[PDB]
Structures are given as structure tokens and as C-alpha cells.
Amino acid sequence: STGSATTTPIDSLDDAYITPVQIGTPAQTLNLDFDTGSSDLWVFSSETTASEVDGQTIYTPSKSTTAKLLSGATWSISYGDGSSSSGDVYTDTVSVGGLTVTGQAVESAKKVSSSFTEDSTIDGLLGLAFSTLNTVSPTQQKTFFDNAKASLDSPVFTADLGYHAPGTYNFGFIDTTAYTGSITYTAVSTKQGFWEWTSTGYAVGSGTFKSTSIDGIADTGTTLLYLPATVVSAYWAQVSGAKSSSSVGGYVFPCSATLPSFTFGVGSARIVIPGDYIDFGPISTGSSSCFGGIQSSAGIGINIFGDVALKAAFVVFNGATTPTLGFASK
């Protein structure tokens, strides 16, 4: 089987992308943030504290004839950005882009942190990291991809995120018309539960490529590109007036500046992030200080190839017995 769904930016900055997901019978369609950095499929629901719901579409298990409470199971998750959610668990039928999984664990939120409440466009998350990170207790649950992968024509999914435009998540096939050139595959470590890989280096603008190993994770649920402070400093040094601001929480630059591109290595191949993808706009409405899309990872513990990086590529998440990642230009 295969599936194919369009993913749409939630705002003019590409701060996140939402993909419609059909849950239950009759279908309830919720717009979920596909997140290759986590492993829980959780949703706003009829069980979420009413004061913590503000415009989201909710899943109501009682209205689904295929929903079944997963007796005793609870979940609680805290994300790298300090947000969190928790609740109980149903199994139900879940379909993405025509691909259907029966018995999928659908984590119903009873509580969500403020950042989720305040974002009316995201109705939950669909984790696509490895199932070892799933938070359901006492019986850990499988991700949608893990449940689907036996049925898929090929055990893969692809992320083709758009720059200021919709893109595509495909399951079970590689759309050879969606990219240019060839796909370069690179090794993945699953030891932390992430799509963790090692970039071969970087270049800033038209500068020379620096060969150096940069271990990091491919994370569709992170907006920005977080890299070691040495790399980030080398990038912003090429932007006149750019500076790291403790008050704002990272590198800012004059909105009048033209940003250089940033290149990252995938084996012997190179992915070029155009400079315009690194512009996240004014730090506050009307300000002439703009927020940079490449930031330091020093205070994270891990480098993160977020959407700024991934949207410059056609990315293959190969879930074969020995997983790999593939990157092509597009």
C-alpha cells in the first residue's frame, strides 16, 4: 500500500506544517504536526480541559464506532521546547493520504501546555521517530509508520516540505519526479530513538566547504537549524550587523540584510539552503531586527536539522531493518 498527503505551512514563516489525518469512523479529520523528532500520536479531544482548547478541532472517541479505550494506558510528553501534554489512550482507525492503519494508538489529551492552546492551527502531533521513544505506559505503543510498514510497498516515508508553500509526505514509495539529481543515503543511529545521522560539513555562502562531522537529528517538528556554536558563528559573521542577543534568545540580524546561503554535506553530496530560507522575520511586529533561522545548539545537547534544513531537500526516511536517511536536491 501507499499513502500521499499534502502538508501545509501554518503561517507565513513556515513555523510548522500541518497534514490532515482521518481518525475514527465516520472519519474525524484533524490537522496534525508530523514530527520525525517524537513518537507519540496525540490529539486535542473531547477529554481536553475545556480552558486549554482554543479553536482546535477535537477528536471525540465516543462518536467513533471503531474507537476502543486502551484500558489503563496513560501518556505524558515533554518536548525540547518546554511544551508538554498528557492524557489517556484509545485505539482507532487512522488514515493518512489514503493509507489506513487499524488499531493505531491515538493519545487523547487531557492536558496541554500553553503553547499548544495558543496555536489554533495544530490539532495534535503524529510522531515519526522510533517507537522506543513512545511515552504510553505501561505498554509502549507503535508509531503510525511502524504499524503501517509491513503493508507498505517499501518501508519508507518521504518528507518534501515546501518553502512558503505546501509540500508532501509520502508513505511507501519514493516519487522519482519530486527531486533532481540522485538521492544520497547516509547511515542512521537509532540508539537515541531519533533519525540521527552525521553531516560531512558545511559552507557559508560561496565560501569553501569545511569538512567536519556534525552529528544531528532530522526533525520535521523543529522549525529551525540548530548547529554547533562554531558553525553558527561562522555563518552570522558573514551578515553585517548580526549578533547573538540574550534578551531575544539567539542570533538576530538587520531586516535590511541579504542573507548568504548555507550548505550542508550529506556524504559527498551537498544540500544548499538559500539565504531567504534563514529569514524568520521581525522579532516583534514592526521591528527592524529579524530572527535568524540558524541558531546554536549549545544549550540543547543535540544538533537539529529542523525544517530550515529539511525544506531544502527531498528527504527519505528509510525504515528498513537497518534504517538510513536519503537527501536529494529539488
Side-chain angles (χ1 to χ4, degrees), residues 1-62 64-67 69-109 112-141 143-148 150-190 192-242 244-330:
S1 58
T2 61
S4 182
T6 297
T7 191
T8 302
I10 62 171
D11 61 25
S12 66
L13 295 175
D14 299 347
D15 281 321
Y17 297 80
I18 45 178
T19 307
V21 178
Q22 281 71 47
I23 311 175
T25 308
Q28 301 179 40
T29 298
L30 275 63
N31 296 327
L32 303 191
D33 183 353
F34 284 29
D35 177 18
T36 62
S38 66
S39 308
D40 286 49
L41 192 173
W42 74 262
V43 297
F44 279 79
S45 76
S46 57
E47 297 181 333
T48 311
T49 300
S51 66
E52 299 180 344
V53 184
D54 183 18
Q56 296 79 12
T57 293
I58 65 168
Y59 168 61
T60 301
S62 62
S64 176
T65 60
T66 46
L69 176 78
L70 185 61
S71 177
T74 63
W75 62 281
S76 187
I77 189 160
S78 312
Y79 295 103
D81 69 352
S83 63
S84 64
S85 51
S86 62
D88 55 13
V89 186
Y90 298 82
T91 56
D92 210 337
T93 302
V94 173
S95 294
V96 178
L99 168 66
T100 298
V101 165
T102 56
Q104 173 67 46
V106 177
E107 306 170 34
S108 168
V112 303
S113 64
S114 294
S115 59
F116 291 110
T117 299
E118 295 161 351
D119 187 342
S120 64
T121 73
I122 291 178
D123 304 319
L125 270 67
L126 191 147
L128 297 167
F130 296 87
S131 292
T132 52
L133 298 177
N134 177 264
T135 81
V136 176
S137 177
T139 308
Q140 189 173 61
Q141 299 296 304
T143 66
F144 174 83
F145 175 60
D146 274 8
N147 285 325
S151 307
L152 299 173
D153 292 353
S154 191
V156 303
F157 70 87
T158 65
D160 183 5
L161 300 181
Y163 166 64
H164 290 176
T168 304
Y169 281 104
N170 288 336
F171 290 86
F173 69 103
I174 293 172
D175 181 355
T176 58
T177 75
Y179 56 90
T180 61
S182 52
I183 306 183
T184 297
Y185 290 83
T186 196
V188 164
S189 171
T190 64
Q192 292 185 64
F194 300 115
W195 293 94
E196 190 171 0
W197 64 290
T198 304
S199 170
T200 49
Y202 66 102
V204 178
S206 58
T208 62
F209 186 83
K210 176 74 166 176
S211 288
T212 185
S213 298
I214 300 170
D215 297 330
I217 67 167
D219 182 0
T220 57
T222 290
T223 311
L224 304 185
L225 176 52
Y226 294 89
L227 294 171
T230 46
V231 179
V232 176
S233 180
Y235 177 82
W236 290 108
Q238 300 305 311
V239 179
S240 191
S244 183
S245 166
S246 67
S247 52
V248 184
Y251 280 85
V252 299
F253 65 97
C255 294
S256 59
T258 288
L259 295 184
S261 65
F262 183 91
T263 300
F264 66 95
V266 182
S268 49
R270 308 285 178 257
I271 297 295
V272 178
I273 306 172
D276 283 357
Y277 288 29
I278 302 166
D279 181 353
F280 280 78
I283 63 170
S284 294
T285 313
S287 173
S288 70
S289 294
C290 273
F291 198 67
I294 285 57
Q295 294 297 339
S296 182
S297 65
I300 293 180
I302 199 91
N303 298 307
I304 305 174
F305 294 86
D307 299 335
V308 161
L310 303 184
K311 70 176 73 167
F314 177 87
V315 189
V316 177
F317 293 81
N318 168 28
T321 306
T322 292
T324 61
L325 280 162
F327 291 82
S329 296
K330 61 183 186 194

